[PDB]
Swiss-Prot record, chain A:
One of its GO terms (biological process) is proteasome assembly. The gene is RPN2. Belongs to the proteasome subunit S1 family. The lineage of its organism: Eukaryota, Fungi, Dikarya, Ascomycota, Saccharomycotina. Acts as a regulatory subunit of the 26S proteasome which is involved in the ATP-dependent degradation of ubiquitinated proteins. GO terms for molecular function: enzyme regulator activity; ubiquitin protein ligase binding. Present with 4750 molecules/cell in log phase SD medium. This is 26S proteasome regulatory subunit RPN2. Pfam families: HEAT_2, PC_rep, RPN2_C, RPN2_N. Disulfide bonds: none annotated. PC repeats lie at residues 362-395, 399-436, 441-475, 476-510, 512-545, 546-581, 582-614, 616-650, 651-688, 694-730. N-acetylated by NAT1. It comes from Saccharomyces cerevisiae (strain ATCC 204508 / S288c).
UniProtKB/Swiss-Prot annotation, chain B:
The gene is RPT6. Transmembrane segments: none annotated. N-acetylated by NAT1. This is 26S proteasome regulatory subunit 8 homolog. The lineage of its organism: Eukaryota, Fungi, Dikarya, Ascomycota, Saccharomycotina. It is found in: Cytoplasm; Nucleus.
Swiss-Prot record, chain C:
The gene is RPT3. This is 26S proteasome regulatory subunit 6B homolog. N-acetylated by NAT3. The 26S proteasome is involved in the ATP-dependent degradation of ubiquitinated proteins. The regulatory (or ATPase) complex confers ATP dependency and substrate specificity to the 26S complex. The chain holds residues 48 to 86 of 428 of the full protein. It is found in: Cytoplasm; Nucleus. It comes from Saccharomyces cerevisiae (strain ATCC 204508 / S288c) (Baker's yeast).
Curated annotation (Swiss-Prot), chain D:
The JAMM motif is required for the deubiquitination and degradation of ubiquitinated substrates. Its EC number is 3.4.19.12. The keyword Acyltransferase does not apply. Component of the lid subcomplex of the 19S proteasome regulatory particle complex (also named PA700 complex). The 26S proteasome consists of a 20S proteasome core and two 19S regulatory subunits. Interacts directly with RPN8 and STS1. N-acetylated by NAT3. The gene is RPN11. Component of the lid subcomplex of the 26S proteasome, a multiprotein complex involved in the ATP-dependent degradation of ubiquitinated proteins. RPN11 is the only catalytically active member of the lid and serves as the essential deubiquitinase of the proteasome. Transmembrane segments: none annotated. It comes from Saccharomyces cerevisiae (strain ATCC 204508 / S288c) (Baker's yeast). Keywords: Acetylation, Hydrolase, Metal-binding, Metalloprotease, Protease, Proteasome, Thiol protease, Ubl conjugation pathway, Zinc. The chain holds residues 154 to 306 of 306 of the full protein. Present with 16400 molecules/cell in log phase SD medium. It catalyses: Thiol-dependent hydrolysis of ester, thioester, amide, peptide and isopeptide bonds formed by the C-terminal Gly of ubiquitin (a 76-residue protein attached to proteins as an intracellular targeting signal). One of its GO terms (molecular function) is proteasome binding. This is Ubiquitin carboxyl-terminal hydrolase RPN11. Belongs to the peptidase M67A family.
Length: 849, 79, 39, 153
């Protein structure tokens, strides 16, 4: 009925009569689409006709027919053909649908066209019909002051025109909203945009607006330099810092980037900045001279060892050979880290009597964490055990060379020349086992000193050690060369180290080379897929062990859906328990970004029958959940503690201490059960050696630095993430082979202190904010919004996470400026106008300065 | 949020589909683990049968085995 | 309104993570049935 | 089982628990269970692992994995059916009775919504026993049909 006969009249003559016929159809296009469905071939056949001028009204009819037919994409073509009868300003569900479909089709096409050309939005490469609605709707949202739809689609659509045009027009320069708008772009572009080049342009475009520093935020400019690692933009800020004359304006950039950039980019801020000019006051700051001196004085003032709980752990039994005396020494050195005090080595005579030549190495290595951070007297501590002073034996002499590595790591350029001379002397031949110990300890020391820095002398010196095929020092060669190849690395060293793995079949060399090939692939992402294929195809157990962490390091930081798919396939098809354990641990390093989905994945794998998978997912859960929230992951590790298997409980106790750090005293109700298990596992005679070692080290991690330091992993506050923390966490999976890799965890332990730090040199004042604070201030090991101000302010542990709720009063005369930051681990921030006769209180700290 | 709200149903749809398939895998994981745990019990040599005769303060009990002779054995630490 | 566009990428992540486990569990349950008939 | 002489295992000799899989002997059960901790002499710490090269890997896959089906193809399909011709017709009929006879015994315990015969493990007995029986019937149905199928005029 109605227009039904008018549909078949389109084949008659008198096209002028058809004009009045199509007008009556325009009313029923939204009513009955059934009769039109049979006439659709006739309606479209008249569109291409040159003598048919009604295509404007003809396209309007088919717009609401194919739409009601169930094809949304087809209705977009008819709506964009006429470009007349379609009303973009009409308010209806039909018009709003085509807009959503046309923009969605524009994103799918412009996604793959951004790689070929970035000018596509200025050219005809994309159909102008899709850009007609797309360009007008984004400009319509700009007039409505809506940045969600304008900036949200531009990031997904991969268009640089909207980002630049909108940000310039919305400038309020307040110096407030313009900073948040940029922050919304950097936060979403990392998770949404997969392309690293598109997000790289956003960092460069937003850099030109704030390059003059119109009272902007230093947090935004610091994320651009670290992420891009560009030498031009790194020194571009200092060029503006020279124009404006201020003592502390360059401090916030200097003190933040010294702990921000990796060893590669720090060389640009020191060596490359020297040629272009710098500030003599910032010479030591950018080189990290006071940075080491800061962390030494943080843990020295307040240190609570609580030997009452420590003595009961190591006095339980004198047996278990050196395994018992080593685990209690490693957990003890964590509490003395940076304070340069030895309770176990000095104050306790008898516990060193049963140590043999093999135990003296790990006992000496405990002092490396204790004295870590000493740039001057670190040699005087090991001086009797250093070469030239001989030693009680040549086995313990090698421990002094390894102790210098943990202390001087990354700053050891001075110690680098001393350690490589011993390697050359021992590279020719070795007739004794203790000779390799001196070569093993010196290689691990130079590897940490040159870690992150590419050095051709270290690669060539350790390469000759690999040719000797040593069963002791052969592992340190690949580990030392791998730390120098961090980052992009040398593509030639990838195939060279991989060839030596297939030639020499070893027990530690082949597994060590797999770790070295993983470190060089860190940050390469898809660039390492060539070597990953060779490891997955090989049937060697040691090559498959390092293939999982190769994916973990390359895909670290920003995650990948294909990286998780590859790791889950290895932990299933492969029957090797060590590879299944290594694959599930690699899952955490890829999932670091999103910690909410981590406990759900590892819990499904913890229900299987394999003990190594349950043990691997035990510590893999405590990695990303350590310095983050979501305390419900403890319930996932609860059934793993009751597992009678010895090594499953070891990795479970360590992961509990990482998540529960600073969670005591009315924060997590489960902290009461973990504090009892500290001495419950050791004193229990039914427990095994591996079970007692997991509970003993876990107690030392929570009490490390006098129960102060915490594990900071993936701090976005900076350019992205903390690199030195990931290095130690990958190592914890490898434990019982030769030496425990928990020693390298000290790189992830940093103190949280709020202290003045005058912009000139150093301050260490005494001041009290008298505002909100956590309850861990007075919390010490024994034998929301609180509305109540607290007098505990300067230094003194507590929680860096909840510091965002702290308020400020006058207190010190220097006063706050920018409302600070809220990150406790920065420990420096900025002081305003030093040299004020406020009668400042200072410490000594003259030994290392 | 037209596309966000429309695709929200796919979140609850795929979530309820995968969780209900995990219970079948978790059941198979419990069956294989149970059979594996019961395998080492059958491989165990087992135990004899006997009757308690007399006990002393030395934690040594005299158990009379029917096929074999009488043997004085030490009691377990759990009892 | 910031969580609306932020969780938009998380919607695709939650879908893929559930699909990857669903694809790997088919190969895992095959080895589970082989161990049951082997005992 | 191998053996390694520890000589004097009293004090400060060498550390066995390093290489691989040590500190065994949980409770009184170790191997035969009579050795427990001390094993033979001063805890020789038994560890044994195997290995395979490139030639030994392809050899075992082409020879013995579970059973040897290689070297000939269509005989293993036919001979299994030919020897079972009188058996398959029998086994389908014999197992047909025992399939329902189990279903006609334990399943009758659970009938109404309330408790009648007090079924406990009975509904789970006939489910697990007949789970493979229904699977084996579908396997032999394809094998009997598949061998006679696939061309051969």
């Amino acid at each position: 009925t109605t227009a039904a006969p008018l549909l078949a009249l389109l084949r008659e003559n008198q096209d002028s009569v058809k004009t009045y016929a199509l007008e009556s159809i325009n009313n029923v296009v939204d009513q009955l689409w059934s009769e039109i469905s049979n006439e659709l071939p006739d309606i479209e056949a008249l569109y291409d006709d040159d003598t048919f001028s009604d295509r404007e009204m003809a396209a309007l009819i088919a717009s609401k027919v194919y739409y009601n037919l169930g094809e949304y994409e087809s209705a977009v073509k008819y709506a964009l053909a006429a470009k007349d009868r379609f009303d973009i300003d009409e308010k209806s569900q039909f018009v709003e649908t085509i807009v959503s479909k046309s923009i969605e089709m524009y994103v799918q096409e412009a996604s793959k066209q951004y790689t070929k050309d970035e000018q596509f939005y200025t050219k005809d490469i994309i159909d102008p019909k899709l850009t007609s609605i797309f360009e007008r709707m984004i400009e319509k949202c700009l007039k409505a002051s809506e940045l969600k739809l304008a900036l949200g689609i531009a990031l997904e659509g991969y268009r640089l025109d909207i980002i630049e045009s909108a940000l310039k027009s919305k400038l309020d320069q307040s110096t407030s909203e313009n900073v948040k708008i940029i922050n919304y772009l950097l936060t979403l572009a990392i998770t949404t945009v997969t392309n690293s080049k598109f997000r790289s342009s956003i960092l460069r475009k937003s850099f030109d607006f704030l390059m003059n520093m119109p009272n902007c935020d230093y947090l935004t400019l610091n994320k651009v330099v670290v992420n891009l690692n560009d030498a031009g933009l790194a020194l571009q800020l200092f060029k503006k810092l020279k124009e404006e004359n201020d003592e502390g304006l360059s401090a916030q950039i200097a003190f933040d980037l010294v702990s921000s950039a990796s060893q590669q980019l720090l060389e640009i801020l020191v060596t490359e900045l020297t040629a272009q000019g710098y500030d003599p006051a910032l010479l030591n700051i950018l080189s990290g001279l006071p940075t080491c001196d800061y962390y030494n004085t943080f843990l020295l003032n307040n240190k609570n060892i609580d030997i009452g709980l420590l003595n009961k752990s190591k006095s339980s039994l004198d047996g278990k050979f050196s395994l018992f005396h080593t685990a209690v020494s490693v957990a003890n050195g964590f509490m003395h880290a940076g304070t340069t005090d030895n309770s176990f080595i000095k104050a306790n005579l008898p516990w060193l009597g049963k140590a043999q030549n093999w135990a003296k190495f790990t006992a000496t290595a405990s002092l490396g964490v204790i004295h870590k951070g000493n740039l001057l007297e670190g040699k005087k501590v090991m001086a009797p055990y250093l070469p030239g002073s001989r030693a009680s034996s040549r086995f313990i002499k090698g421990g002094s060379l390894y102790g210098l590595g943990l202390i001087y790591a990354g700053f050891g350029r001075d110690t680098t020349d001393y350690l490589k001379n011993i390697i050359v002397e021992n590279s020719g031949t070795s007739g004794d086992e203790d000779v390799d110990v001196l070569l093993h300890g010196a290689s691990l020391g130079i590897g940490l000193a040159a870690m992150g820095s590419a050095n051709i002398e270290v690669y060539e010196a350790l390469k000759e050690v690999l040719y000797n095929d040593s069963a002791t020092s052969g592992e340190a060669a690949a580990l030392g060369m791998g730390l120098c190849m961090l980052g992009t690395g040398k593509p030639e060293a990838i195939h060279d180290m991989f060839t030596y793995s297939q030639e020499t079949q070893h027990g530690n060399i082949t597994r060590g080379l797999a770790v070295g090939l993983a470190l060089i692939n860190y940050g390469r992402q898809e660039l390492a897929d060539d070597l990953i294929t060779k490891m997955l195809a090989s049937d060697e157990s040691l090559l498959r062990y390092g293939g999982a962490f190769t994916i973990a390091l390359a895909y670290a930081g920003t995650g990948n859906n294909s990286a998780v798919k590859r790791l889950l396939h290895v932990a299933v098809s492969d029957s090797n328990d060590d590879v299944r354990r290594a694959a599930v641990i690699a899952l955490g390093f890829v999932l670091l970004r999103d910690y909410t989905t981590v406990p759900r994945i590892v819990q499904l794998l913890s229900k299987s029958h394999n003990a190594h998978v349950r043990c691997g997912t035990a510590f893999a859960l405590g990695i990303a959940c350590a310095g983050k929230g979501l305390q419900s992951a403890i319930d996932v590790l609860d059934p793993l503690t009751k597992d009678p298997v010895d090594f499953v409980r070891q990795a479970a106790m360590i992961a509990l201490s990482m998540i529960l750090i600073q969670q005591t005293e009315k924060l997590n109700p489960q902290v009461a059960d973990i504090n009892k298990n500290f001495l419950s596992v050791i004193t229990n005679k039914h427990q095994e050696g591996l079970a007692k070692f997991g509970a003993c080290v876990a107690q030392g991690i929570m009490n490390a630095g006098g129960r102060n330091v915490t594990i900071q992993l993936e701090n976005a506050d900076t350019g992205t993430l903390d690199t030195k923390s990931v290095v130690g966490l990958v190592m914890f999976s490898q434990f019982w082979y030769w030496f425990p890799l928990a020693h390298f965890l000290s790189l992830s332990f940093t103190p949280t202190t709020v202290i003045g730090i005058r912009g000139s040199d150093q301050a260490i004042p005494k001041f009290q904010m008298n505002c909100y604070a956590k309850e861990d201030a007075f919390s010490y090991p024994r034998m929301k919004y609180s509305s109540k101000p607290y007098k505990v302010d300067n230094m003194t542990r507590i929680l860096p996470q909840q510091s965002r709720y702290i308020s400020f009063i006058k207190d010190d005369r220097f006063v706050p400026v920018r409302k600070f930051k809220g990150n406790n681990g920065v420990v420096v921030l900025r002081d305003r106008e030093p040299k004020e006769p406020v009668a400042l209180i200072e410490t000594v700290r003259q030994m290392k300065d | 949020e037209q596309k966000i709200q429309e695709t929200e149903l796919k979140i609850r749809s795929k979530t309820e589909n995968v969780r209900r398939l995990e219970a079948q895998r978790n059941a198979l994981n419990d069956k294989v683990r149970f059979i594996k745990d019961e395998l080492r019990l059958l491989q165990e040599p087992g135990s004899y049968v006997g009757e308690v005769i007399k006990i002393v303060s030395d934690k040594k009990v005299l158990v009379k085995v029917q096929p074999e002779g009488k043997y004085i054995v030490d009691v377990a630490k759990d009892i | 309104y910031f969580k609306l566009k932020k969780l938009e990428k998380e919607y695709e992540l939650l879908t893929l993570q559930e699909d990857y486990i669903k694809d790997e569990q088919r190969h895992l349950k095959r080895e589970l049935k082989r161990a049951q008939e082997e005992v | 089982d191998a053996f390694r002489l520890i000589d004097t295992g009293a004090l400060i000799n060498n550390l066995e628990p390093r290489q691989t899989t040590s500190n065994t002997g949980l409770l009184n059960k170790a191997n035969i269970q009579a050795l427990i901790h001390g094993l033979n002499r001063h805890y020789y710490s038994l560890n044994i692992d195997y290995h395979k090269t490139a030639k030994e890997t392809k050899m075992l896959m082409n020879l013995h994995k579970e059973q040897w089906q290689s070297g000939l193809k269509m005989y293993d399909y036919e001979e299994k059916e030919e020897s079972n011709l009188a058996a398959t017709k029998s086994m389908v009929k014999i197992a047909e009775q025992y399939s329902k006879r189990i279903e006609e015994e334990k399943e009758l315990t659970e009938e109404e919504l309330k408790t009648r015969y007090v079924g406990r493990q009975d509904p789970k007995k006939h489910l697990s026993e007949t789970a493979d029986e229904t699977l084996e019937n579908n396997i032999v149905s394809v094998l009997t049909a598949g061998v006679n199928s696939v061309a051969i005029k």
